[PDB]
């Protein structure tokens, strides 16, 4: 409930400050007078998504190091990182990282 | 060229050695803390069993009082075919208590920061 | 089906140990060293019977043993213990490593008064053995009788009588 | 042996980042199988008590099992202290 | 009934984005729904899994969805009773992936590498 | 269809994750470990048809542990009766259920 | 109980919205992702309630695979747009029964 | 007194980013053989007040054709996230003690790109949309390596708890254990906040600027806690607070120095920098930092 | 694509299918389906054109929806029983959801709509793979959980599939759509016998796979995708047209050809369970498949259609690449009826 109150306070202050900023200068009287779709940017976004999935796989490593099966855990972590490096190498070699 | 790499490797090795010593000491300290917890555990288990049994008995007395006029009710009937002891759920111990302590026992650890 | 048996509220009356977590943590090592036997009897009973209602007497015994231990500490080593657990109570993690000095004093005092030796590293986590007169429960799971297995036919294989016997096939 | 040395020398120039990456990765793959302290790390992980040690029922046939924590029977942690 | 309130909101956001108005606004509705669902998981006790929702789902996948779009035109009773010791059981079960789930790691890594290859081959064009 | 490669080779590719009561890390038990263990031991080596007919007691207890429908029904009945009685005005809660009790360690 | 029912109801609503298909194949992909998010929440709640420790990997796994599928779908969408200039569902009528 | 604690966290951060503008102008001026603002106020101390008042009293140029919804939503999210990132930080005690604090910071940082995307989409211009897309791509690219470096560093800590970082660095700094990861982390924080040499892109504008500078200070404070750990005495936390604030100020002035020292990259140049120099080195060092504690039997305690 | 990449993708498709076939955990079966779907998309799109892309997106949407409902059924089954093993389904709602998901994965009616369009959009090699290999995993899963299927729903979908295939094949001049509707009808025949005997299902699947492989390879050899294009083959290679005519007669269930073996056996099995009306309707409806097979045989080999002058040049050239196992497939799809009692091998 403390985090809920903290988020509520942050959002409330942000909303209040932005609203007063947007409404204070609106009381005075004044004059009051495409296609391209680059493939490269989509490829960058997709590469980010896949690498982020592999990061999601690698995340539990700080806890994985207390198992008594240290050899198996080390082998599997190195396997995950090696396949991540292989994905990067495949994207590099097939001209997937050019501009 | 060579000297810069030598300095970098040297500071890396010094840091590795210092962290190795400190982490081994931290492992020993954690073992000591876990041993203290292990020594304290049996008293906590006895107190927990006594508290759970007291709550169950109080709920049983209140159920006997409330469900007196219900025709087909049986006071303190089990929902299981087996006679083995079953660990009670949260709603069984705090079902008839006030909302503040219900919410405590449910969300106190999760909401504590 | 059936009625859940619960002990009366009188069965759950015992002189409670009314000290906080810092006091317990300060004396945890000596408490584990001195009060090992009732605690291990109670824990063996708890893990064997799998029923809280079958372990009440051992719980009262462990409470009594803790009370005796704390009375000895009070009668002998009051002030160093007070300083030690005030130390421990200050910290938000209740760490042992901040004021070892006070700990030393407490240790020294008990070694002069009760001849108590603090257990070393790796000693309170040992798996020990308990000599108890409580009979070993035979069906702690309250299991029913297992259904009998299938007959498990066995014998010598002979060729199928007149073959496959599928429509007009003679083999 | 000359071609490999020439390739390594040409890669160390104009591509030092990749050479460092492959060197560090290969060392991380190879060294753990040769270090003698990985067994020590396994032992340290084994000696961390997360659970309660449930005692065994004594029948007079377990001399290796101590009856008190201070008894000399059972595993020791002197090696961990000496580390 | 805090959990129930979160659940009702979750369904309301789903109805909001399932009407499929203006896919940018459907994405905003799905973002709100994902936030509420992550809140449900956090309030239940699954801190790591809720944060995994919040990071992976919201910050990678819905971000990529919005990027692609921009290119174009009753409770509290069923709970436990005891404690978990000196660790969190969810973290232990998740970390068991490298010691118990070797097969899972192998198949998932192979699938991710194949996915990279497949995406490149599909977007090649020609 | 099913080619039991694991059973042929003794591999254990995915059997470690199939049931609650199978070697959890740090010996952390499932919430319904005992009911599942009893049901599995009842039904073992007997076949699905006979297991469904003859181990119904154990499966019913396991499902009751899993979903707790009967327990919630009973608690709801008791709470509804208490609410009706207090609305009528014949039953009053004791100090233990009103927060006026003496807590124990 | 009620919480489980709401999660299922959300899944059913997302599936119905996917099967409505007003336009904008991106909306179909969004409905698929909402279905997967509902599945994630439901499985996580079940696994946490019953203290199935070893099953805690299962949600993560699901998420990863689903996101991979999402990427695949997005790629397909883009190619379709690059042929027609829009992601309109009615433009995929070249093949007929 | 939790509300008082929240307000005492929020307001001083806003004042600090208010005066960081004056500090930046003064430092840049003195590195440019000139002076910063020294007229408005005794030494320019009143300059931030003047800029704030002028910005809040000037007309806001609404596009008159754009979607007001996301237009007003984007600054709210930006400032809310910028203020929320500060709550788990220990100095030496956090306002909110989280088990997975680091993961919480990562999740909010991943959220931060939505303000960019929505402000670009609601600007009602193709060129602003292109700029927003480029910024989003750069940000996600660099947060990948941020995450990998962060997990590699925390492999020596034992958990994601931010307070444990104080215990980990009780005798030596983490900079000595891993300086290459620190270098790449610093560059990635520079590229995350669109700071020179990566700066490739009235009221709402003030809010966006405030969120950006709060993010800068927050990133430098996180870097100081993560790599230059201050000694903390439980009976006098003011010493730790002083050391932590001094290190944060030093890192912020280093940001200003770097801005004043170098030309800026091209877009393809920074993308190549990341994807072909930081990612391979980060992966290799992640393998090394996985293997090292097992090799030397130096695994940290908590699990 | 690159041949190395193509080989890797094909191996990934087969490995996903085998992972479905060898695992005992529901999550691993789901993962196998996901891997198969992921590797299948590039194979369909190998020859890049708008039709292939459209077919790939249709297939992706269908399979992704099916996999999502499969995950939902798994989760509901786990909720009502803490089980991950693939066994009895333990819940009627979960089992209905699983049956519907597997039916859409297989293309059974009323989820049949995607099969003709996907087959028409893709090339003949991709169609061969899609119509032969992509049926093994869902049918194996259905076989493993056959004892829990509600027979009413399964039989309804099977009879609907037979009727829909028979009626939809009558209207087709494109050969790939003819193959798709034939596949739908054969899937209906296969699934109508699951509640009673899975060995009959497997035998029907093997016979159908042999016949489909033979016909697709014959269509690839004489590179024709329409009726009129196939009507020119007699003027270059009449042997191919005669072999295709005999194969089409076999595919219609005419004795003494191989295609008679499944229906016969299935009918017998159904009669053993006091089911009489349904096998009768099934044979009556298979008459429609036989009719449009006979129409193809009329246009292909039993009569001689007009030719073109430029065919003369084609007389001077021979096929450079010869498909192995085509003669074996033809023989196995025409002449294995006398070996019928071999089905006790639990094929
Ligand atoms: C019973 C159940 C069976 C169900 C259906 C059977 C599946 C049939 C499809 C499998 C492969 C497809 C195929 O062979 O084409 C159809 C094929 C006709 O050949 P085609 O039309 O001339 O080939 C056109 C290709 O698409 C032209 O493509 P390509 O030129 O790029 O071919 C490259 C070639 C050459 O591959 C290489 O280059 C080798 C290099 C090694 C790569 C290292 C990668 C390791 C990582 O590799 C292959 O052809 C794929 C082989 C995959 C390996 C499987 C193990 O017909 C059959 O294969 C019928 C098979 C009979 C059933 C299987 C055996 C009986 C049981
Ligand atoms: C037998 C046939 C071999 C050839 C055919 C291969 C078929 C395709 C390849 C896939 C087969 C996978 C083999 C590994 C199966 C996993 C189980 C086995 O390895 O045991 C593990 C041992 O781990 C091994 O170290 C795993 C090493 C294998 C990974 C290295 C290479 C993997 C490549 C596989 C193909 C993927 C793509 C190819 C990339 C090059 C379990 O360790 P353990 O601790 O006792 O038990 C855990 C339970 N505890 C915790 C209670 C104790
Ligand atoms: C057109 C007719 C069909 C042709 C089929 C293709 C022919 C080429 C295939 C070559 C032989 C493949 C056999 C593989 C070698 C060893 C197989 C062994 O390891 O597996 C056994 C299985 O062996 C195979 O099942 C036997 C295959 C023999 C097929 C012949 C039957 C054809 C029907 C009658 C038509 C006559 C055809 C004769 C000409 C070829 C154990 O099975 P099991 O893991 O325990 O249970 C899983 C299967 N269940 C679920 C159904 C029970
Ligand atoms: C926005 C930020 C979302 C997440 C904030 C909280 C993150 C967190 O981990 O705190 C959980 C906190 C502390 O837990 P631990 O760290 O594990 O330690 C306690 C045990 N010793 O405990 C809680 O679960 C309380 C918070 C849960 C309820 C509220 C969760 C957030 C709900 C938000 C719904 C609205 C979302 C709208 C859409 C968002 C799109 C940007
Ligand atoms: C066996 C260990 C593996 C695990 C460690 C891996 C860690 C991460 C590294 C992999 C990340 C992806 C690498 C991708 C490789 C792509 C190579 C490539 O194509 O780059 C070439 C350039 O690089 C090459 O020439 C090819 C590779 C060169 C060799 C690299 C190192 C090889 C091994 C050297 C170290 C051996 C061990 C060191 C021992 C030293 C003593 C300790 C083209 O570059 P362009 O961007 O096009 O620019 C060119 C125009 N200016
Ligand atoms: C046996 C034990 C083994 C131990 C393993 C570790 C060994 C370490 C080996 C050396 C590792 C050092 C790596 C450090 C980072 C390297 C990254 C790098 O080199 O990238 C550069 C580029 O990096 C940069 O230049 C980025 C700088 C951008 C300007 C920003 C200002 C930075 C300068 C100010 C100093 C920053 C200090 C950081 C302190 C952090 C404190 C927390 C390559 O770019 P190019 O020259 O174009 O060549 C590749 C193209 N073909």
Curated annotation (Swiss-Prot), chain A:
Annotated Gene3D superfamilies: NADH:ubiquinone/plastoquinone oxidoreductase, chain 3 (1.20.58.1610)
InterPro entries, alphabetized: NADH_UbQ/plastoQ_OxRdtase_su3, NDAH_ubi_oxred_su3_sf
Localisation per UniProt entry: Mitochondrion inner membrane
Membrane topology category: Multi-pass membrane protein
Enzyme superclass (EC): translocase
BP term (GO), one: mitochondrial electron transport, NADH to ubiquinone
Enzyme Commission number(s) of this protein: 7.1.1.2
Keywords: Electron transport, Membrane, Mitochondrion, Mitochondrion inner membrane, NAD, Respiratory chain, Translocase, Transmembrane, Transmembrane helix, Transport, Ubiquinone
Spans traversing the lipid bilayer: 3-23, 41-61, 72-92
Matching Pfam families: Oxidored_q4
GO MF term set: NADH dehydrogenase (ubiquinone) activity
GO cellular component: mitochondrial inner membrane; respiratory chain complex I
Catalytic reactions on record: a ubiquinone + NADH + 5 H(+)(in) = a ubiquinol + NAD(+) + 4 H(+)(out)
Subunit structure: Core subunit of respiratory chain NADH dehydrogenase (Complex I) which is composed of 45 different subunits. Interacts with TMEM186. Interacts with TMEM242.
Similarity comment: family membership: Belongs to the complex I subunit 3 family.
Cited function: Core subunit of the mitochondrial membrane respiratory chain NADH dehydrogenase (Complex I) which catalyzes electron transfer from NADH through the respiratory chain, using ubiquinone as an electron acceptor. Essential for the catalytic activity of complex I.
Name recorded for this polypeptide: NADH-ubiquinone oxidoreductase chain 3
Naturally occurring in which organism (per UniProt): Sus scrofa
Gene that encodes it: MT-ND3
From Swiss-Prot, chain E:
Any GO MF annotation of the entry: NADH dehydrogenase (ubiquinone) activity
Stretches that traverse the bilayer: 1-18, 22-42, 44-64, 100-120
Broadest EC class assigned to this enzyme: translocase
Catalysed conversion reaction: a ubiquinone + NADH + 5 H(+)(in) = a ubiquinol + NAD(+) + 4 H(+)(out)
Keyword Translocase tagged: yes
Annotated InterPro entries: ComplexI_Subunit6, NADH_UbQ/plastoQ_OxRdtase_su6, Nuo/plastoQ_OxRdtase_6_NuoJ
Cellular compartments annotated: Mitochondrion inner membrane
Pfam families recorded: Oxidored_q3 (PF00499)
Main location: mitochondrion
Membrane topology: Multi-pass membrane protein
GO biological process: mitochondrial electron transport, NADH to ubiquinone; mitochondrial respiratory chain complex I assembly
Record keywords: Electron transport, Membrane, Mitochondrion, Mitochondrion inner membrane, NAD, Respiratory chain, Translocase, Transmembrane, Transmembrane helix, Transport, Ubiquinone
E.C. no: 7.1.1.2
Gene Ontology cellular component terms for the protein in this record: mitochondrial inner membrane; mitochondrion; respiratory chain complex I
Subunit structure: Core subunit of respiratory chain NADH dehydrogenase (Complex I) which is composed of 45 different subunits.
UniProt record similarity statement: Belongs to the complex I subunit 6 family.
Function: Core subunit of the mitochondrial membrane respiratory chain NADH dehydrogenase (Complex I) which catalyzes electron transfer from NADH through the respiratory chain, using ubiquinone as an electron acceptor. Essential for the catalytic activity and assembly of complex I.
Listed name of the protein: NADH-ubiquinone oxidoreductase chain 6
From Swiss-Prot, chain G:
Native species: Sus scrofa (Pig)
EC number: 7.1.1.2
Reactions catalysed according to its record: a ubiquinone + NADH + 5 H(+)(in) = a ubiquinol + NAD(+) + 4 H(+)(out)
Entry's transmembrane regions: 1-20, 28-48, 60-80
Gene: MT-ND4L
Membrane topology, as annotated: Multi-pass membrane protein
Cellular component GO terms, alphabetical: mitochondrial inner membrane; respiratory chain complex I
Source superkingdom: Eukaryota
Protein localization: Mitochondrion inner membrane
Main location: mitochondrion
Protein name: NADH-ubiquinone oxidoreductase chain 4L
From Swiss-Prot, chain H:
Record carries keyword Transmembrane: yes
Entry GO CC: mitochondrial inner membrane; respiratory chain complex I
One Pfam family in the UniProt entry: NADHdh
Gene Ontology molecular function, alphabetical: NADH dehydrogenase (ubiquinone) activity
Cellular location(s): Mitochondrion inner membrane
Catalytic activity field: a ubiquinone + NADH + 5 H(+)(in) = a ubiquinol + NAD(+) + 4 H(+)(out)
Keyword tRNA processing in record: no
Topology relative to the membrane: Multi-pass membrane protein
PROSITE patterns per record: COMPLEX1_ND1_1, COMPLEX1_ND1_2
Keyword line: Electron transport, Membrane, Mitochondrion, Mitochondrion inner membrane, NAD, Respiratory chain, Translocase, Transmembrane, Transmembrane helix, Transport, Ubiquinone
Biological processes per GO annotation: aerobic respiration; mitochondrial electron transport, NADH to ubiquinone; mitochondrial respiratory chain complex I assembly
Classification via InterPro entries: NADH_UbQ_OxRdtase_su1/FPO, NADH_UbQ_OxRdtase_su1_CS
EC number: 7.1.1.2
Superkingdom to which the source organism belongs: Eukaryota
TM regions (residue ranges): 2-22, 68-88, 100-120, 146-166, 171-191, 208-228, 238-258, 279-299
Known function: Core subunit of the mitochondrial membrane respiratory chain NADH dehydrogenase (Complex I) which catalyzes electron transfer from NADH through the respiratory chain, using ubiquinone as an electron acceptor. Essential for the catalytic activity and assembly of complex I.
Subunit-level organization: Core subunit of respiratory chain NADH dehydrogenase (Complex I) which is composed of 45 different subunits.
Recorded family membership: Belongs to the complex I subunit 1 family.
Descriptive protein name: NADH-ubiquinone oxidoreductase chain 1
Underlying gene: MT-ND1
């Amino acid at each position: 409930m403390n985090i809920m109150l903290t988020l509520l306070t942050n959002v409330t202050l942000a909303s209040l400050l932005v609203l007063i900023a947007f409404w204070l200068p609106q009381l005075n009287a004044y004059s009051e007078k495409r296609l391209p779709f680059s493939m490269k940017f989509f490829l960058v976004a997709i590469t980010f998504l896949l690498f982020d999935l592999e990061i999601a796989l690698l995340l539990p490593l700080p806890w994985a190091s207390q198992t008594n099966n240290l050899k198996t855990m080390l082998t599997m972590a190195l396997f995950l990182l090696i396949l991540l490096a292989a994905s990067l190498a495949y994207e590099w070699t097939q001209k997937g990282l050019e501009w | 060229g060579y000297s810069m790499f030598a300095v970098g490797i040297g500071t890396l090795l010094f840091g590795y050695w210092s962290m190795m010593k400190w982490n081994r000491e931290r492992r020993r300290l954690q073992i000591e803390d876990f041993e203290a917890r292990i020594a304290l555990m049996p008293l906590f288990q006895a107190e927990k069993d006594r508290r759970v049994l007291q709550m169950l008995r109080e709920n049983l007395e209140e159920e006997a009082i409330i469900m007196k006029d219900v025709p087909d009710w049986k006071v303190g009937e089990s929902v299981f075919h087996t006679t083995r002891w079953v660990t009670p759920m949260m709603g069984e111990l705090y079902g008839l208590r006030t909302n503040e302590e219900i919410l405590s026992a449910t969300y106190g650890f999760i909401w504590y920061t | 089906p059936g009625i859940v048996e619960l002990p009366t509220l009188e069965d759950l009356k015992v002189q409670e140990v009314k000290v906080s977590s810092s006091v317990l943590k300060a004396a945890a090592h000596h408490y584990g060293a001195q009060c090992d036997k009732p605690n291990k009897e109670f824990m063996l009973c708890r893990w064997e019977e799998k029923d809280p209602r079958r372990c009440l007497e051992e719980g009262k015994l462990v409470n009594q043993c803790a009370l005796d231990f704390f009375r000895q500490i009070k009668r002998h080593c009051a002030e160093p213990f007070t300083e030690y657990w005030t130390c421990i109570d200050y910290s938000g993690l209740q760490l042992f490593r901040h004021c070892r000095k006070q700990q030393a004093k407490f240790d020294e005092c008990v070694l002069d008064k009760l001849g108590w030796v603090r257990p070393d590293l790796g000693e309170l986590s040992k798996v020990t053995k308990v000599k108890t007169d409580r009979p070993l429960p035979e069906n702690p799971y309250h299991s029913r009788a297992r259904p009998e297995p299938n007959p498990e036919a066995e014998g010598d294989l002979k060729p199928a009588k007149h073959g496959s016997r599928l429509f007009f096939w003679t083999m | 042996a000359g071609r490999i040395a020439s390739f390594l020398k040409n890669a160390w120039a104009k591509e030092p980042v990749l050479v460092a990456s492959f060197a560090i990765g290969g060392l991380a793959i190879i060294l753990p199988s040769l270090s003698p302290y990985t067994n020590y790390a396994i032992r340290i992980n084994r000696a961390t008590p997360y659970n309660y040690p449930v005692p065994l029922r004594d029948d007079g046939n377990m001399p290796d099992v101590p009856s008190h924590p201070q008894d000399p029977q059972g595993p020791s942690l002197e090696w961990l202290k000496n580390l | 009934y805090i959990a129930f309130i979160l659940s009702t909101i979750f369904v309301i956001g789903f109805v909001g984005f399932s009407s499929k108005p203006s896919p940018i606004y459907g994405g905003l509705g799905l973002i709100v729904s994902g936030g509420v669902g992550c809140g449900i998981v956090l309030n239940f006790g699954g801190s790591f899994l809720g944060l995994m929702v919040f990071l992976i789902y919201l910050g990678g996948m819905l971000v990529v969805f919005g990027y692609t779009t921009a290119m174009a035109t009753g409770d509290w009773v069923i709970y436990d009773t005891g404690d978990s010791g000196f660790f969190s059981e969810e973290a232990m079960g998740i970390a068991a992936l490298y010691s118990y789930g070797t097969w899972l790691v192998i198949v998932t890594g192979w699938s991710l590498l194949i996915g990279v290859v497949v995406i490149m081959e599909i977007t090649r064009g020609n | 269809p099913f080619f039991d490669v694991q059973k042929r080779l003794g591999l254990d590719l995915d059997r470690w994750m199939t049931i609650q009561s199978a070697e959890q890390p740090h010996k952390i038990p499932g919430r319904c470990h005992a009911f599942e263990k009893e049901w599995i031991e009842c039904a073992h080596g007997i076949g699905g048809i006979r297991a469904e007919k003859e181990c119904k007691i154990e499966f019913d207890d396991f499902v009751e542990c899993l979903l707790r429908q009967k327990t919630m029904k009973r608690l709801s009945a008791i709470k509804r009766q208490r609410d009706k009685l207090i609305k009528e005005g014949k039953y009053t809660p004791p100090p233990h259920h009103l927060g006026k009790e003496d807590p124990r360690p | 109980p009620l919480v489980y029912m709401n999660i299922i109801m959300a899944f059913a609503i997302a599936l119905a919205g996917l099967l409505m298909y007003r336009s904008h194949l991106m909306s179909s992909l969004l409905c698929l992702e909402g279905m997967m998010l509902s599945l994630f929440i439901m499985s996580t709640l079940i696994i946490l309630n019953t203290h199935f420790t070893l099953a805690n990997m299962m949600p993560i796994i699901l998420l990863v695979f689903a996101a991979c599928e999402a990427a695949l779908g997005l790629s397909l969408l883009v190619m379709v747009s690059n042929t027609y200039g829009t992601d309109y569902v009615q433009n995929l009528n070249l093949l007929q029964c | 007194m939790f509300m008082i604690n929240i307000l005492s966290l929020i307001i001083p951060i806003l004042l600090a980013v208010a005066f960081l503008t004056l500090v930046e102008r003064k430092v840049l001026g003195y590195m440019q053989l000139r002076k910063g603002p020294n007229v408005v106020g005794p030494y320019g101390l009143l300059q931030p007040i003047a800029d704030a008042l002028k910005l809040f009293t000037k007309e806001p140029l609404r596009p008159a054709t754009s979607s007001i919804s996301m237009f007003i939503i984007a600054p709210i999210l930006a400032l809310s996230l910028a203020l929320t990132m500060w709550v788990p930080l220990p100095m030496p005690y956090p306002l909110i003690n989280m088990n997975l604090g680091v993961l919480f910071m990562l999740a909010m940082s991943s959220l931060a790109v939505y303000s960019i995307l929505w402000s670009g989409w609601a600007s009602n211009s193709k060129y602003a949309l292109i700029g927003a897309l480029r910024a989003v791509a750069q940000t996600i690219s660099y947060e990948v390596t941020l995450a990998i470096i962060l997990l590699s560093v925390l492999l020596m800590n034992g958990s994601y708890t931010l307070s444990t970082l104080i215990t980990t660095q009780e005798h030596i700094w983490m900079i000595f254990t891993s300086w290459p990861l620190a270098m790449m982390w610093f560059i990635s924080t520079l590229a995350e906040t669109n700071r020179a040499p990566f700066d490739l892109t009235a009221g709402p504008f003030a809010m966006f600027f405030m969120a950006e500078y709060a993010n800068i200070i927050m990133m430098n404070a996180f870097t100081a806690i993560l790599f230059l750990g201050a000694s903390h005495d439980p009976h006098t936390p003011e010493l730790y607070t002083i050391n932590f604030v001094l290190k944060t100020l030093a890192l912020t002035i280093t940001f200003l120095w770097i801005r004043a020292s170098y030309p800026r990259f091209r877009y393809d140049q920074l993308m190549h920098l990341l994807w072909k120099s930081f990612l391979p080195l980060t992966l290799a060092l992640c393998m090394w930092h996985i293997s090292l504690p097992i090799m030397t039997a130096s695994i940290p305690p908590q699990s | 694509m690159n041949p190395i990449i193509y080989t890797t993708l094909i191996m990934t498709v087969m490995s996903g299918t085998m992972l479905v076939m060898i695992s005992s955990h529901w999550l691993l079966i789901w993962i196998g389906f996901e891997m198969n779907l992921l590797a299948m998309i590039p194979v369909l799109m190998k020859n890049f054109n708008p039709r292939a892309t459209e077919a790939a997106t249709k297939y992706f949407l269908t399979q992704a929806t099916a996999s999502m409902m499969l995950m939902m059924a798994i989760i509901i089954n786990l909720l009502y029983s803490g089980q991950w093993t693939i066994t009895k389904m333990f819940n009627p709602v979960a089992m209905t959801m699983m049956t519907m998901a597997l039916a859409m994965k297989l293309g059974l009616s009323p989820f049949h709509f995607w099969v003709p369009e996907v087959t028409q959009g893709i090339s003949l090699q991709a169609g061969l793979l899609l119509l032969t290999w992509q049926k093994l995993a869902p049918l194996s899963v259905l076989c493993q959980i056959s004892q829990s299927i509600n027979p009413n729903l399964m039989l309804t979908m099977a009879m609907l599939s037979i009727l829909i295939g028979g009626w939809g094949g009558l209207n087709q001049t494109q050969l790939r759509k003819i193959m798709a509707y034939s596949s739908i009808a054969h899937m209906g025949w296969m699934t109508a016998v699951l509640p009673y005997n899975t060995t009959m299902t497997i035998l029907n699947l093997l016979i159908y796979i042999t016949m489909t492989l033979a016909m697709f390879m014959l269509l690839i050899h004489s590179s024709a995708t329409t009726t009129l294009s196939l009507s020119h083959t007699w003027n270059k290679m009449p042997v191919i047209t005669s072999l295709m005519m005999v194969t089409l007669l076999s595919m219609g269930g005419l004795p003494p050809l191989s295609g008679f073996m499944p229906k016969w056996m299935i009918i017998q099995e159904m009669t053993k369970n006091e089911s009489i009306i349904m096998p009768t309707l099934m044979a009556m409806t298979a008459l429609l498949n036989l009719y449009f097979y006979m129409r193809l045989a009329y246009s292909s080999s039993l009569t001689m259609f007009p030719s073109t002058n430029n065919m003369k040049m084609k007389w001077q050239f021979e096929h450079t690449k010869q498909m192995k196992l085509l003669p074996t497939m033809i023989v196995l799809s025409t002449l294995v009826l006398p070996m019928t009692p071999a089905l006790s091998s639990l094929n």
